[PDB]
């Protein structure tokens, strides 16, 4: 649901790297959820 806000097309490598940062930083995930 957060990756829907990734409007730019991207490589699988960039996407996995975003997902890894999100998974490692649940407080960043929470901040993205909160601004919705």
């Amino acid at each position: 649901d957060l990756l829907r806000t990734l409007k730019s097309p991207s490589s699988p490598q960039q996407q996995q790297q975003v997902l890894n940062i999100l998974k490692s930083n649940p407080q960043l995930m929470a901040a993205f959820i909160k601004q919705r």
Partner: protein
């Protein structure tokens, strides 16, 4: 897997001459001809330039890169190391403008690697940006190769300027904007009659 994808864009004398996106487990090495790290060869300036004096000096800078400018991710840090003879100065700035207004952020070291980007404070600043800080965190690394950082001159005078964007950081700032964060200054003043 723990690699980062880097978009590399090189400029010679204010002209874009090269762009490549590379996601290598060992990072990259910016080199001047054809060691760990993916070698990214900066092109001969005769492909894109016509000023013969600038071409000569760019060619000289590129011939002194040696093993190259190494850039890689390890943990929370981006690391950089200068493996040749060209002194290289770096700053984190904007996509289309190398100048931050506060000079360079450092010089790339030779004898050991040196940190050039800390993911930790980026994420802190990304979170406060989503909370209304009004300032998006910067992520575009710029390297001035073979010349001092352009403080008192337009950056377009510099022989070799290389922008390196970790694309996952670009994407994270875009996600914050899509979610509603804005960096537009409260002092913006439109001139419309």
């Amino acid at each position: 897997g723990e690699e980062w994808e880097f978009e590399v864009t090189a400029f010679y004398r204010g002209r874009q001459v090269f762009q490549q996106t590379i996601s290598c487990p060992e990072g990259l090495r910016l080199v001047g001809s054809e060691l760990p790290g993916w070698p990214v060869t900066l092109p001969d300036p005769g492909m894109s330039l016509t000023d013969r004096g600038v071409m000569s000096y760019v060619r000289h800078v590129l011939s002194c890169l040696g093993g190259g400018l190494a850039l890689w991710r390890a943990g929370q840090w981006l690391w950089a190391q200068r493996l040749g003879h060209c002194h290289t100065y770096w700053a984190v700035s904007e996509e289309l403008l190398p100048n931050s207004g506060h000079g360079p952020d450092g010089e790339v070291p030779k004898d050991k690697e040196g940190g050039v980007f800390d993911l930790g404070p980026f994420i802190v600043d990304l979170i406060t940006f989503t909370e209304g800080s009004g300032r998006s965190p910067r992520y575009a690394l710029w390297f001035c190769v073979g010349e001092s950082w352009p403080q008192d001159q337009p950056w377009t005078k510099r022989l070799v300027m290389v922008k390196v964007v970790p694309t996952c950081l670009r994407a994270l700032v875009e996600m914050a904007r899509v979610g509603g964060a804005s960096s537009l200054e409260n002092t913006v003043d439109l001139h419309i009659s």
